[PDB]
Design an enzyme around this catalytic site. Structure first.
Site, PDB file in Angstrom:
ATOM      1  N   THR A 116      -4.061   6.098  -3.795  1.00 46.64           N
ATOM      2  CA  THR A 116      -2.766   6.368  -3.185  1.00 46.64           C
ATOM      3  C   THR A 116      -1.662   6.346  -4.233  1.00 46.64           C
ATOM      4  O   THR A 116      -1.039   7.377  -4.509  1.00 46.64           O
ATOM      5  CB  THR A 116      -2.470   5.351  -2.081  1.00 46.64           C
ATOM      6  OG1 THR A 116      -2.466   4.029  -2.634  1.00 46.64           O
ATOM      7  CG2 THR A 116      -3.521   5.434  -0.985  1.00 46.64           C
ATOM      8  N   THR A 117      -1.412   5.176  -4.822  1.00 53.36           N
ATOM      9  CA  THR A 117      -0.351   5.053  -5.815  1.00 53.36           C
ATOM     10  C   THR A 117      -0.784   5.588  -7.176  1.00 53.36           C
ATOM     11  O   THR A 117       0.020   6.196  -7.890  1.00 53.36           O
ATOM     12  CB  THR A 117       0.087   3.590  -5.930  1.00 53.36           C
ATOM     13  OG1 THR A 117       0.563   3.132  -4.658  1.00 53.36           O
ATOM     14  CG2 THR A 117       1.198   3.437  -6.959  1.00 53.36           C
ATOM     15  N   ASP A 131       0.836  -1.192   0.000  1.00 55.50           N
ATOM     16  CA  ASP A 131       0.000   0.000   0.000  1.00 55.50           C
ATOM     17  C   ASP A 131       0.875   1.247   0.000  1.00 55.50           C
ATOM     18  O   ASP A 131       1.794   1.372   0.816  1.00 55.50           O
ATOM     19  CB  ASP A 131      -0.929  -0.003   1.213  1.00 55.50           C
ATOM     20  CG  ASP A 131      -1.938   1.132   1.185  1.00 55.50           C
ATOM     21  OD1 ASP A 131      -1.982   1.879   0.184  1.00 55.50           O
ATOM     22  OD2 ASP A 131      -2.694   1.277   2.169  1.00 55.50           O
ATOM     23  N   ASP A 170     -10.134  -0.700   2.169  1.00 60.05           N
ATOM     24  CA  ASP A 170     -10.384  -0.330   0.780  1.00 60.05           C
ATOM     25  C   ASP A 170     -11.532  -1.132   0.184  1.00 60.05           C
ATOM     26  O   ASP A 170     -12.201  -0.659  -0.743  1.00 60.05           O
ATOM     27  CB  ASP A 170      -9.116  -0.520  -0.052  1.00 60.05           C
ATOM     28  CG  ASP A 170      -8.038   0.489   0.293  1.00 60.05           C
ATOM     29  OD1 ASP A 170      -8.359   1.507   0.939  1.00 60.05           O
ATOM     30  OD2 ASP A 170      -6.868   0.263  -0.084  1.00 60.05           O
TER      31      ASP A 170
END
Lengths: 66, 507, 495
Positions: free
Chosen positions: C80-81, C47, C360
């Protein structure tokens, strides 16, 4: 032996699984794991591709060995 | 000597360079890291200069004059420093040629004196001519909201902005009286206007599902001490060796809290608010009496409650007077955003209000909240001052034009000094075009074309690049800003040019 | 201090080196990393939120990635990424425009108009879930957590964890607002046991040893009384330092819960009345006790009535695995306003990886209910949005013509990154996805990071939420603007 290498600290925690589960052949696990890194090092530098594809090849080869 | 004077020139340019991208509503924002390790981003020159704390004496003068611009006026703190620092660059080549800075400072007193007289000539008082009462303040709000992400939703935003100013006495208005609470998540067009005051509601403790959003006439009373008996600091130790006595030596404390019940119960206050977080002790009995309680309220929002219903803060529960209570017309609570929001509505005595804003993200609302503050100052100063001048490049170009003609009749060094001051006035419209993306070279040449045709109202269009009149663009600026900007920039410049040598003692 | 010359060049290189760290971890085939906490604990996870949160740096440009990632976990959690890599693509394309004389605000305003037009293009090609069938919607919830957990040992028992998130979201979220509160989700886990003993609980766990062993492990119905009533008191119950028993039976509170401990002789009075007591409870744990069981907090024994006190099914003690803590289960049997996530594992790292993956998974269910129209992700969404903006770039003249071309090329970074992270030629794969969507027919075919049967994920019923992907492209443009709008860097010293 104190190890300042953050990569070597992971190998210590991995070897503790063999001692708790069974406790026999702990040294043979580290020796065999070190030989796998010698062959994986030659596969990367000659490729420079993510090792996860090579990891999938180990799962198919380990099934035939058992 | 002249070596320290040159060093003071670059010191003003370094401070001016930081405020150049922050000029204008579309201008860039500066990032400054305070020693407190808190991220602060603002386009207003006041807050920018207050956080720098520059040890240089001439650079601190530009910071001190910004506080005077924010005190007596409150608008134009960014442009007053840019205009004051521009005179340092124009007077730089004049020092090497042998011209003393005293004759340069003397020419500014005659140039500003003639410029202030032209400001009153350009200010035309208009109220009911070709304008109505409701549409007067609505057309001013859409000017600052243009060229923004809210331009599509600006139709609903102007109606809520005008009602915030009309909810207060037109004789005394303040931007701090209108509160804004950011609501993460939700649609932007679904925001509503609130007559009373609201808070963040950081209280996470249990006892929900009661105290419904529908109230009739709740009574508001301020609280000082804590309702919970838990002692955070001190303690006590008492132990006995008797076996049978262990029973009752675990038991009785809270019975002492019952002494403060009858005093509060006979009052009948249905709202419990305090500057300290309300404990976990009783969330229920209040709901049985239809009494509401909200903890973890900031001290800034507690002062607005006193000015709303006319409450008072008392230390104990004994001397609390019954007439200190107050009530609103209606209560409302919304759960939108996975967080409950408490707000008061229908307070006739309220001297403050709250406007809720909704958006996709918290960083998106931060740009919408700050863009509204620029529109509030235009709406606020419209009713306060009836004398307005055409902005957006209109007035700034003509002030520099008249000084060119009056300098022809003046003989001596003052001719080139006034012309340099008139040329120094071109930095304000420059940065406005460069920060908005428009080319400052092409507009500067094309704007001076129609500017010589006898019309003094031609401005710069901030939406589509072109030359024209800002009267159709609804760009209005008060006369008090343009008059005080020339006096503050000249006074701050005269103090720097009058100091040849800088001395700093350590101790 | 750098302004107008080296500022625009340094901000692109500073943000590119930081964003290049997590580019290799994007996707299920992405590679993990070894993080070292200051306390001496080593954490390894895929993550990006954990990696970016642990970064302590004085660079003013990279601080925007940490502040933005905090709000992404609550809204979506999967941005996030993906957003950081997408935001770096807009900065690399903007660097070439700065040397050509393009104004930075025009680049910022150009990406806003290009993003709004691309959203309307996916509105025509999106498909409906509930309109196709009702049970196909539940099949998406069962396989939602299977994709993220497929790279872990949990993938063997994944069929058990699939049904836990289906009933938990329905209770906490109402179809009116269609929102899920993060404060109402209790995530608790401990070391020891296995992952097969994880159960879905409709209420707070509240591990308790029942104090003195004489107290029974079950709550008596008390002559057909309604439910089981509880009492939460944080008051410091203590001696008389500088009556009540008769008012307890009138209210009918079965159990008393406190934040601090009790004496040994204090619980003996309530022992004969079959009224257990609870001690040593955290402050945050008290939030889910009153909400799940619909109970209240006793203001006093005199004025407390039986009308507003909550009623649950029962309270019993159920041992979990070989753990000697002897935990308990409090059920409800009625729809509550909150749920409690119960996660177990044989290792401390397995528990932490399973708790974050479940967070998530709960947000995807909220996005599918809030928006029925969805698109096929996994590289197919970025290629479709690329051909839509690039085709409309020729129809739009002016300066925005080149702003649309750079925005279309920036969207190609994600499928190429997924192609690089999959061990395949990024350019050779990108040309294949564009050829299948033009000469053959318009469809969604993405890049496979994990080995599958064939292409055309629509056959495998792989779906991604549209509003979840729509929130990512909005935060990416919002982040790219704030970087270009700052031309100055000012920081003080350290004394």
């Amino acid at each position: 032996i104190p190890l300042d290498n953050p990569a070597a600290k992971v190998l210590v925690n991995i070897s503790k699984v063999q001692d708790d589960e069974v406790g026999d052949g702990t040294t043979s696990v580290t020796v065999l794991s070190a030989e796998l890194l010698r062959e994986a090092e030659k596969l990367i530098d000659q490729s420079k591709i993510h090792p996860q594809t090579i990891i999938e090849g180990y799962r198919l080869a380990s099934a035939a060995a058992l | 000597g002249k070596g320290q004077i040159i060093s003071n020139i670059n010191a003003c340019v370094a401070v001016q360079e930081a405020l150049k991208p922050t000029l204008g509503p579309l201008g860039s924002d500066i990032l400054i890291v305070t020693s407190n390790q808190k991220t602060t981003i603002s386009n207003d020159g006041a807050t920018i200069l207050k956080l720098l704390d520059v040890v240089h004496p001439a650079a601190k003068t530009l910071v001190d004059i910004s506080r005077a611009q924010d005190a007596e006026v409150g608008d134009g703190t960014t442009s007053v420093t840019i205009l004051a620092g521009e005179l340092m660059k124009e007077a730089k080549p004049f020092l090497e040629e042998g011209i003393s800075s005293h004759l340069i400072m003397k020419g500014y007193r005659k140039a500003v004196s003639l410029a202030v007289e032209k400001i009153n000539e350009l200010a035309v008082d208009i109220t009911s001519e070709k304008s109505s009462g409701r549409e007067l303040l609505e057309r001013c709000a859409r000017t600052a909201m243009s060229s923004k992400l809210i331009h599509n939703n600006a139709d609903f935003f102007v109606k809520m902005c005008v009602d915030a100013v009309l909810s207060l006495d037109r004789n005394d208005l303040d931007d701090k009286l209108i509160g804004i609470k950011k609501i993460p998540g939700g649609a932007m067009e679904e925001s509503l206007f609130i007559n009373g005051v609201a808070f963040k509601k950081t209280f996470s403790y249990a006892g929900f599902e009661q105290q419904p959003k529908k109230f009739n006439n709740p009574k508001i009373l301020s609280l000082n001490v804590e309702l919970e008996l838990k002692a955070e600091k001190d303690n006590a130790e008492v132990r006995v060796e008797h076996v049978e006595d262990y029973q009752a030596i675990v038991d009785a404390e809270w019975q002492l809290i019952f002494e403060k019940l009858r005093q509060v119960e006979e009052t009948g206050a249905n709202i419990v608010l305090s500057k300290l977080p309300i404990g976990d002790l009783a969330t229920q009995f209040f709901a049985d009496r239809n009494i509401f309680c909200a903890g973890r309220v900031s001290a800034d929002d507690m002062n607005r409650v006193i000015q709303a219903v006319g409450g008072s803060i008392q230390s104990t529960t004994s001397d609390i007077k019954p007439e200190h209570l107050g009530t609103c017309a209606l209560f409302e609570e919304m759960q939108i955003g996975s967080e409950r929001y408490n707000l008061f509505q229908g307070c006739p005595q309220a001297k403050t209000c709250t406007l809720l804003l909704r958006g996709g993200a918290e960083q998106v609302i931060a740009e919408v909240e700050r863009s509204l503050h620029d529109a509030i100052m235009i709406v606020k100063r419209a009713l306060q001052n009836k004398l307005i001048v055409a902005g957006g490049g209109a007035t700034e170009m003509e002030v520099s034009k008249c000084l060119r003609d009056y300098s022809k009749t003046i003989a001596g060094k003052q001719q080139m000094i006034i012309n340099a001051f008139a040329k120094a006035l071109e930095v304000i419209p420059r940065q406005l075009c460069e920060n908005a993306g428009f080319d400052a070279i092409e507009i500067l040449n094309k704007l001076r074309l129609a500017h010589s045709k006898g019309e003094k109202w031609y401005g710069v269009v901030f939406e589509t690049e072109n030359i024209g009149d800002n009267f159709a663009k609804f760009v209005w600026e008060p006369a008090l800003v343009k008059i005080n900007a020339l006096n503050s920039a000249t006074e701050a410049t005269n103090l720097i040019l009058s100091v040849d040598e800088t001395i700093t003692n350590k101790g | 201090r750098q302004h107008g010359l080296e500022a625009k060049k340094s901000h692109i290189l500073a943000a590119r080196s930081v964003a290049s760290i997590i580019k290799t971890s994007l996707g299920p085939r992405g590679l993990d990393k070894i993080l070292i906490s200051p306390d001496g604990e080593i954490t390894i996870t895929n993550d990006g939120a954990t990696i970016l949160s642990q970064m302590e740096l004085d660079n003013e440009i990279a601080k925007l990635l940490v502040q933005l990632s905090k709000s992404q976990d609550d809204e979506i959690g999967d941005g996030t990424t993906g957003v950081v890599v997408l935001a770096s693509a807009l900065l690399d394309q903007a660097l070439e425009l700065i040397q050509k004389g393009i104004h930075p605000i025009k680049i910022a305003n150009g990406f806003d108009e290009a993003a709004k037009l691309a959203i309307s293009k996916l509105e025509e090609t999106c498909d409906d879930i509930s309109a196709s069938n009702d049970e196909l919607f539940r099949d998406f919830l069962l396989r939602a957590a299977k994709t993220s957990l497929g790279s872990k040992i949990v993938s063997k028992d994944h069929d058990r964890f699939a049904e836990m998130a289906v009933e938990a979201v329905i209770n906490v979220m109402d179809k009116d607002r269609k929102d899920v509160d993060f404060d109402l989700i209790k995530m608790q886990g401990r070391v020891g046991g296995s992952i097969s003993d994880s159960k879905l609980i409709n209420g707070v766990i509240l591990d308790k040893d029942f104090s003195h062993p004489q107290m029974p492990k079950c709550v008596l119905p008390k002559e057909g009384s309604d439910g089981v009533k509880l009492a939460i008191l944080t008051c410091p119950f203590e001696p008389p330092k500088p009556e009540m028993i008769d008012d307890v039976k009138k209210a009918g509170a079965d159990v008393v819960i406190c934040q601090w401990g009790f004496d040994d002789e204090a619980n003996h009075l309530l022992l004969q009345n079959d009224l257990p007591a609870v001690r040593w409870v955290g402050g945050q744990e008290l939030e889910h006790i009153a909400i799940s069981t619909n109970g209240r907090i006793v203001p006093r024994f005199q004025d407390l009535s039986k009308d507003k006190l909550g009623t649950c099914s029962r309270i019993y003690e159920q041992e979990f695995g070989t753990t000697k803590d002897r935990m308990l289960i409090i059920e409800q049997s009625k729809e509550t306003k909150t749920v409690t996530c119960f996660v177990r594992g044989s290792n401390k790292m397995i528990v932490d990886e399973a708790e974050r993956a479940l967070h998530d998974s709960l947000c995807v269910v909220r996005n599918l209910v809030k928006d029925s129209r969805v698109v096929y992700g996994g590289g197919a969404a970025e290629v479709t949005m690329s051909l839509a903006v690039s085709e409309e770039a020729d129809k739009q003249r002016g300066i925005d013509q080149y702003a649309f071309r750079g925005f279309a090329q920036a969207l190609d970074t994600i499928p190429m990154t997924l192609a690089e992270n999959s061990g395949l030629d990024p350019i050779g794969t990108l040309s294949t996805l564009k050829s299948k969507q033009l000469k053959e027919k318009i469809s969604n075919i993405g890049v496979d990071c994990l080995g599958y049967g064939s292409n055309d994920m629509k056959e495998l019923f792989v779906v991604d939420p549209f509003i979840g992907k729509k929130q990512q492209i909005l935060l990416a443009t919002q982040l790219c603007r704030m970087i270009l709008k700052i031309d100055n860097v000012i920081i003080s010293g350290k004394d």
